[PDB]
Write a protein that binds this ligand. Sequence first.
Ligand code: NI
Ligand code: NI
Ligand code: NI
Ligand code: NI
Ligand code: NI
Ligand code: NI
Ligand SMILES: [Zn+2]
Ligand SMILES: [Zn+2]
Ligand SMILES: [Zn+2]
Ligand SMILES: [Zn+2]
Ligand SMILES: [Zn+2]
Ligand SMILES: [Zn+2]
Ligand SMILES: [Zn+2]
Lengths: 74, 72
Amino acid sequence: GSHSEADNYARELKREQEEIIRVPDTEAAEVAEILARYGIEPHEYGPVVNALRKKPQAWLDFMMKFELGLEKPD
Amino acid sequence: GSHSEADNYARELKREQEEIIRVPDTEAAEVAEILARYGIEPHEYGPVVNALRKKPQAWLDFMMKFELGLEK
Ligand code: NI
Ligand code: NI
Ligand code: NI
Ligand code: NI
Ligand code: NI
Ligand code: NI
Ligand SMILES: [Zn+2]
Ligand SMILES: [Zn+2]
Ligand SMILES: [Zn+2]
Ligand SMILES: [Zn+2]
Ligand SMILES: [Zn+2]
Ligand SMILES: [Zn+2]
Ligand SMILES: [Zn+2]
């Protein structure tokens, strides 16, 4: 039929927040991996990671876009 | 006739590259504003923006993925 389940966004949003809460250290290295793909060095991305960790809402939206390739609608 | 997925990307890769050559500082601001979107402070994102300006293909890759949302 015509579809109305919470899409992949809604489902991924849930999963991603838990990880942040439950294994923040793992989610922080994920950001390193992502930025490191583009040649960036730890001394350059260290403070970025550090900024996101102190901002649980930002960090979630960051992971959504950078790790998972999905935009917050509106 | 044909529209290769390779073609649509090489067309957009061309355009954005011609932007990095013609208006590089404007493109550096594009990265800035994308990062600042996530409450990162210019002292924090500055060096990243700098890191990219020094590796133009990475900087080009970065825009392709995160500014335009395209994949290889
Ligand atoms: Ni149906
Ligand atoms: Ni994870
Ligand atoms: Ni360095
Ligand atoms: Ni045709
Ligand atoms: Ni541009
Ligand atoms: Ni600060
Ligand atoms: Zn169906
Ligand atoms: Zn569906
Ligand atoms: Zn997933
Ligand atoms: Zn995840
Ligand atoms: Zn993650
Ligand atoms: Zn046609
Ligand atoms: Zn462009």
